[PDB]
Design the sequence.
C-alpha cells in the first residue's frame, strides 16, 4: 500500500503555469505505476498522464501532450505535473494515483491508491 | 432450383454459434428431459435466421450501447442497449432479445470498454474486466438494458460502452451455468416470447449431434461446455445461399478428404440441427481433416446407418 | 465451374480481418509513402491465404499455448505458443508467425485464461486481464513464444493458456500504436520473412480503399483505427470458392439493393485489396444497406469513374 | 484493507475431519468476498470455495463440493471450512483471502488480502 498527497494547486490566470507535486511513501517496486487524473465539477474523471515510477518512462494523453509534463524528482520521493499554457478547461481537482500493475502506461485503469487531490482553478 | 450445400470446413475451421470460440469436437448426447431451445445458433437450411441469431461471430454474447445510470446493488451499472450494428433497439420487435444476447443461465465474464462522445472529454477511453449474470434481476435485455458488474467503479462513465465476452462460469452454488436453460429476457417472473422452437430427435434410435466447444472459465472446474446445433459458418453460408429445401431432411456424410471415404452419415433437418443413429453419450472419434458434405434430400422413411 | 463472386453483406455485416470487431465504415486514404504490408486479412481473389491469415474471426490477435516460465522483467510470463487449433507450432514453417499473430506495433489488451491438465489440479480454471506489447523484446512469436504482462501474478500457473484480445492502445509515449508497422516477429535486430507482399496504388489518381473499424482502447484519446484491405467474410468466401482469377483486376460496383443503382465502382486487385479514383482522405458517405457486387474482369488500362 | 488469520490445521488420518477457521477484521462492505484457497508443496494455488460476507452466499468447486462447506459465524467475525472425508490429496496449506469486488463467487481472481495460512496434513 502506498500513501499519496497532492499539492501546488491554486487560482491562476489562463496563459499562466503551475507545477503540481505528489509525494509518495510506502512500498513501491519495479512495476509501480504513477498516474495523474483530473475531475471538473459534474464531469467524469479524466486520465491525464502516467509514468513508470522506477524508470520514469511516461505516457501523456493527446489532450495535454504539448502543455503538461509528468516527471520524477531526481532524489525526492516526489512526482510532478508541469502545467503550461493553462486554460479554463483545465479547472478541476487534480489527483495522483499509484498502481502495482505495469499494464500499459496508456491504460487508465487498475489504480488502487489515490491522494486527496489539489484544486486547480483557471480563469480568463 | 438453387442446389443446397455446406461450406467445406474442418472442425478447427468452425466457430461456435453460441459463444465466440472455435469448435473443439463433435458430441452426440443421450436423449433426456432437456428441451434444447437455444436462441443463438439458429437458422433454417434455406437461410432464415431465428431466435437471437445474427451473422457476426464477434457479436455472439456481446453487448453494445450506453451506460446511463447506476444503482446501489451488485449489478451496479445500467447499460442501455443498442443493436450490435449501432442501430436503435426496438423492444417491440418480434425477437426474444437483441440479436447476440446470451442464451444460457450463468455469468459471462469479459471486458467493458468506453469511448466518450459529447461535451465531456470526447474520445477519451477506458476498459476493465466486467461480468454479466443472466440471472441478474436487472438482466432485462428484451426490455432494453442489462446491468454490469465491473471491477473498478471509479474509472467508468455515462458514455458509449461495449461488452466483449471472454468466457463463462457458474455464478454461485445456487445459480449454476446451465447452457440449456434460457435467461429471463424480460426479467424475473416474466416469460420469454418470439423463441425459436425446441429441438428433439423424433426417429427411433436417433440422437442430437452437437458442435462442442470448451470455452474459458474463471475459477473452479467447470468444463465450459457450450454446444451449438450448427456452427456459425453454416449459418452464414445458408444465409448467403437461401437454397430451397427439397424435403424436411438433408442427408449429410462426414468425409475424410485424404481418403475419399465416408466416416458416418447424419440427418440435417430443415430447421437447422443434426441427428445421428447412436445410443449413449459419445465424443466422436474423427480425423482432423474431416468435414460434412451434402448428399441428398431424403423423406421421413430414411433410416440412418448406425454410427 | 465456380465463378468469381463476392458475398452479399452490408458493412455492419462485415468483420474486420485484422481485429475481431465489425466494420464501422469505408475509408479511402491519401497516397502516402505509407508501406501497407499488413499480414492479417491477406487473401488472393482465388482463395490463397497469405501472411498470418487464418479463417476464424475469433483467431485474429488471439494466442494459444502454455505458460512455462516467468522472468524478472516487464513482460514477465513466458507463453510457449501452439497453433490456434491446438496443433504444435513449427517455427520453420513458411509463414511470418503463427496464424492470427497481431500485425502492428502497440499494446493489445485482453484476458488470459487457463485450464489445468496433468497432475496439478486438472480442470481448474482462472482468468484475468493481460497485455501483450508487440514492442516487447520477448515478443518472438515466429520463434514460438510471447511474454505476457498480467494483472495478478499470484493467480497464474504453468498451464495451458489462451489470450483473448479486446482492444489496442499506444504502449507509452515512445512506443505508439502504429497499425502499419509490422512487429519484429523474431525479436529485436531480426527481420521478417514469408510476408504477404506490400500493396499500394499503381495508377494515376487512385487510392487504397479500407474497411475501417474503431476498436476499443484502454485510456487516452487514440481513435483505435484498424484498416483492413478486405473483410474476413470475403476471405472466408474466396477460400471456399477458389475461383481462378481471369485477369489481374476485378471491377466491382457498390450497389444500393433497395434502389438497384450503383453508388460507385472500384478495382479489386488479384492480391486482395481495393483501389478507388479519389484524391484526399475521405470517409465514404454510403447508404447503410450498400454492398459490393462483382461486375467483370477488366485489364490494366481500365479507368475508374471518379468516386 | 482487511486482515486475516487461519487456524485449525494439523495432522489427521484419512477419513477424519477438520474445521478450519479464518478470523476477519477491517473495513468490509456489501460486496466483500471471502474465499478459501490451498497450495500443496510445489504445486499451484488451488481455488477451493468463496462466500459473500454480507449474505453468506456460497460457491464451492466441484472437487470439494460434497465434503467441504464454507460458512460464517456472523456473531463473531470468523469464516470456517468444514473438511470431511479427508484424503491424502487434501494435504496442502490452506489460505483465506478477501476481495472488495463482487465479480462472481466462482471467480478465483482479484483477491487482494491473504492470511498467512495453516498447514493441513492428511495421513
Sequence:
Amino acid at each position: 500500500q502506498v500513501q499519496l498527497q497532492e499539492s501546488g494547486g491554486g487560482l491562476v490566470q489562463a496563459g499562466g503555469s503551475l507545477r503540481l507535486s505528489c509525494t509518495v511513501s510506502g512500498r513501491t517496486d519495479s512495476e509501480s505505476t504513477m498516474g495523474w487524473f483530473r475531475q471538473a465539477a459534474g464531469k467524469g474523471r479524466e486520465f491525464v498522464a502516467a509514468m513508470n515510477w522506477r524508470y520514469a518512462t511516461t505516457y501523456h494523453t493527446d489532450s495535454v501532450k504539448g502543455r503538461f509534463t509528468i516527471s520524477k524528482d531526481s532524489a525526492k520521493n516526489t512526482m510532478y505535473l508541469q502545467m503550461n499554457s493553462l486554460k479554463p478547461e483545465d479547472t478541476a481537482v487534480y489527483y495522483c494515483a499509484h498502481r502495482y500493475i505495469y499494464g500499459s502506461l496508456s491504460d487508465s485503469g487498475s489504480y488502487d491508491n489515490w491522494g486527496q487531490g489539489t484544486q486547480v482553478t483557471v480563469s480568463s | 432450383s438453387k442446389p443446397f450445400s455446406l461450406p467445406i470446413l474442418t472442425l478447427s475451421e468452425l466457430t461456435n454459434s453460441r459463444f465466440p470460440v472455435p469448435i473443439d469436437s463433435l458430441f452426440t448426447a443421450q436423449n433426456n428431459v432437456l428441451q434444447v431451445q437455444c436462441q443463438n445458433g439458429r437458422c433454417t437450411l434455406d437461410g432464415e435466421l431465428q431466435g437471437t441469431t445474427q451473422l457476426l461471430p464477434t457479436g455472439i454474447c456481446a453487448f453494445r450501447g450506453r451506460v446511463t445510470a447506476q444503482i446501489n446493488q451488485r449489478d451496479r451499472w445500467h447499460m442501455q442497449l443498442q443493436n450490435l450494428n449501432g442501430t436503435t433497439y426496438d423492444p417491440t420487435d418480434d425477437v426474444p432479445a437483441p440479436l447476440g444476447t446470451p442464451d444460457f443461465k450463468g455469468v459471462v465474464f469479459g471486458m467493458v470498454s468506453q469511448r466518450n462522445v459529447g461535451n465531456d472529454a470526447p474520445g477519451s477511453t477506458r476498459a476493465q474486466q466486467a461480468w454479466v449474470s443472466t440471472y441478474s434481476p436487472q438482466f432485462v435485455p428484451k426490455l432494453g438494458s442489462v446491468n454490469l458488474r465491473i471491477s473498478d467503479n471509479d474509472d467508468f462513465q455515462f458514455q458509449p460502452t461495449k461488452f466483449t465476452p471472454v468466457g463463462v462460469n457458474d455464478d454461485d452454488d445456487g445459480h449454476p451455468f446451465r447452457q440449456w436453460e434460457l435467461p429471463n429476457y424480460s426479467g424475473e417472473l416474466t416469460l420469454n416470447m418470439n423463441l425459436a422452437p425446441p429441438v428433439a430427435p423424433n426417429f427411433p434410435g436417433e440422437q442430437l449431434l452437437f458442435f462442442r466447444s470448451f470455452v474459458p472459465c474463471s475459477g473452479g472446474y467447470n468444463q465450459g461446455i457450450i454446444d451449438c446445433l450448427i456452427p456459425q459458418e453454416w449459418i452464414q453460408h445458408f444465409y448467403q445461399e437461401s437454397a430451397p429445401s427439397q424435403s424436411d431432411v438433408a442427408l449429410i456424410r462426414y468425409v475424410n478428404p485424404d481418403t475419399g471415404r465416408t466416416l458416418f452419415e447424419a440427418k440435417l433437418h430443415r430447421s437447422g440441427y443434426i441427428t445421428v443413429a447412436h445410443s449413449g453419450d459419445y465424443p466422436l472419434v474423427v480425423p482432423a481433416n474431416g468435414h460434412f458434405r451434402f448428399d441428398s434430400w431424403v423423406n421421413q422413411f430414411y433410416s440412418l446407418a448406425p454410427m
Observations:
- Residues 62 and 125 of chain B are 19 Å apart (CA to CA).
- Chain B has two domains: 1-59+170-307, 60-169.
- The first strand of chain B starts at residue 25 and ends at 28.
- Residues 1-59+170-307 of chain B form one domain.
